[PDB]
Amino acid sequence: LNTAIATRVNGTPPPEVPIADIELGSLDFWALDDDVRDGAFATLRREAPISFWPTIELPGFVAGNGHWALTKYDDVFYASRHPDIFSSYPNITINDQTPELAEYFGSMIVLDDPRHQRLRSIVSRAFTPKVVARIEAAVRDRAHRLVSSMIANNPDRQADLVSELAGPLPLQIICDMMGIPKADHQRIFHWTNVILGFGDPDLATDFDEFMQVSADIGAYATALAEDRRVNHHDDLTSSLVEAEVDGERLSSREIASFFILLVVAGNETTRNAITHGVLALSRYPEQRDRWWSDFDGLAPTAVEEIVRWASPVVYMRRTLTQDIELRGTKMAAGDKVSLWYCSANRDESKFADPWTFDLARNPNPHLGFGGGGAHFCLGANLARREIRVAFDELRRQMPDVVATEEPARLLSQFIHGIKTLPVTWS
Numbered sequence: 263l264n265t266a267i268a269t270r271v272n273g274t275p276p277p278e279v280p281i282a283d284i285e286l287g288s289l290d291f292w293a294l295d296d297d298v299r300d301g302a303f304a305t306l307r308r309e310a311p312i313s314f315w316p317t318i319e320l321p322g323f324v325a326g327n328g329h330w331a332l333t334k335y336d337d338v339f340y341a342s343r344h345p346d347i348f349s350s351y352p353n354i355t356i357n358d359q360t361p362e363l364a365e366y367f368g369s370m371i372v373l374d375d376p377r378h379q380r381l382r383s384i385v386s387r388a389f390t391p392k393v394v395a396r397i398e399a400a401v402r403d404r405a406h407r408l409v410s411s412m413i414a415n416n417p418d419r420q421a422d423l424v425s426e427l428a429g430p431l432p433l434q435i436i437c438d439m440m441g442i443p444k445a446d447h448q449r450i451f452h453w454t455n456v457i458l459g460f461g462d463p464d465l466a467t468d469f470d471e472f473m474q475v476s477a478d479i480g481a482y483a484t485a486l487a488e489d490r491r492v493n494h495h496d497d498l499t500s501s502l503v504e505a506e507v508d509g510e511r512l513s514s515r516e517i518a519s520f521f522i523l524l525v526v527a528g529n530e531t532t533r534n535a536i537t538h539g540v541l542a543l544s545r546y547p548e549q550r551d552r553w554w555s556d557f558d559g560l561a562p563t564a565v566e567e568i569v570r571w572a573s574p575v576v577y578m579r580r581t582l583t584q585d586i587e588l589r590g591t592k593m594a595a596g597d598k599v600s601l602w603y604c605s606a607n608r609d610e611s612k613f614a615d616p617w618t619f620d621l622a623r624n625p626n627p628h629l630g631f632g633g634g635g636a637h638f639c640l641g642a643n644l645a646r647r648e649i650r651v652a653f654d655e656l657r658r659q660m661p662d663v664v665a666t667e668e669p670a671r672l673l674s675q676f677i678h679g680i681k682t683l684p685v686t687w688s
């Protein structure tokens with residue numbers, strides 16, 4: 263299409279990045295383009311598989327102690343499967359948890375079992391493979407309407423993939439599951455965007471705004487919950503207010519935190535898998551060709567490889583409950599430990615040809631949904647289906663859809679985000 267992005271050779275390894283150029287506790291490092299980032303993690307995996315880092319500043323948050331970065335696959339996996347040692351309390355981002363933040367962000371993702379499991383059971387039936395298989399009809403026609411409207415909205419055949427499809431599809435689905443009405447979708451989207459875009463001047467850099475948005479979304483969850491308290495609807499919000507996770511009902515804060523976890527995770531995750539997928543297809547059109555020629559035959563492995571490639575969630579943090587030594591590095595009880603999924607997903611000792619984007623890759627033990635165990639992504643089956651249906655609807659309405667500019671990238675250490683990706687089609 264000649265308006266298109268330049269092609270790229272598949273299996274191209276990243277630039278050489280000297281260790282002296284790697285500074286994970288600087289925001290400027292997260293600004294560097296993706297190739298240099300991948301290069302920097304390659305250097306770490308080889309020369310400092312476990313290394314220590316001061317935690318990033320950014321206004322209004324509390325950096326506190328630094329963290330031991332696990333950049334190897336086997337260590338990320340080991341840490342995920344040993345939660346007695348690598349605890350999710352008190353926080354799964356690198357910054358210290360505060361009681362003010364805990365009002366909105368003290369959900370089960372920052373708790374250990376047995377309380378974590380008891381909370382998780384409240385909503386987990388809805389995310390089961392049997393059940394996500396049953397909402398294919400809702401997914402399909404949100405996706406189909408979005409691709410149609412992408413076409414109708416754009417006589418020029420020039421659109422932003424992010425706001426026209428990748429963004430609103432996983433948003434509409436999670437809000438529908440929560441029971442959030444249509445008129446509120448956009449406001450919800452703008453809130454989770456600021457929550458998980460903090461540090462990026464296109465999203466927010468003033469902590470006052472972050473606190474306001476948090477309060478607004480917490481206030482919003484509370485009002486919806488209270489509604490559902492009196493009038494059951496058959497949405498996840500009703501399950502939340504009806505639950506006893508205990509022999510006790512959930513507190514306001516527990517409801518607010520659970521609501522915000524679902525909606526943020528639902529809104530700031532699969533949209534990036536989808537946008538990175540389209541970009542990757544734009545760079546490697548042989549891959550686009552193979553998949554379009556055999557959509558259903560290649561879909562299971564295509565969807566996993568888009569997730570491996572995008573690694574939408576860059577890292578999660580844990581905290582040691584006891585001393586432990588790994589790979590010859592002694593770490594102490596109370597130390598922060600960060601699990602770099604984006605690095606595990608390029609690990610030369612687990613993946614042949616880690617730099618090759620291969621929609622037929624089989625097996626594909628990636629850690630895009632984390633390393634397995636107690637906090638395994640609750641939305642994994644939902645996300646896979648969202649991804650599959652989105653590309654299915656593109657393949658059938660605009661099969662040659664293709665990026666026309668490099669993406670505007672989210673400045674973020676936690677989320678491999680794309681803010682906008684101009685695409686074209688014929």
Ligand code: HEM
Pocket residue numbers: 342370371372382432436523524525527528529531532535569573574575578603630631632633634635636637638639640641642644645
């Ligand atoms: C490609 C899309 C997605 C990716 C890559 C992803 C990634 C992750 C990762 C890395 C974790 C932490 C896992 C661990 O600690 O071992 C997680 C947890 C979680 N995710 Fe997903 N996520 C995605 C989509 C979604 C969706 C659509 C939802 C729907 C609400 C969702 C809901 C959750 C929840 C609730 C948790 C916490 C589970 C728990 O603490 O037990 N995710 N996700």
Ligand SMILES: CC(C)CCC[C@H](C)CCC[C@H](C)CCC[C@@H](C)CC(=O)O
Pocket residue numbers: 317318319320323324325355356357363367457458460522523526527530531575675676
């Ligand atoms: C599956 C994933 C994407 C769900 C994560 C959802 C929950 C709501 C994460 C909490 C987000 C926190 C409060 C944002 C702060 C991160 C940042 C400021 C850390 C730092 O200072 O370096």
Ligand SMILES: [Ca+2]
Pocket residue numbers: 415416417418419420421
């Ligand atoms: Ca347009």
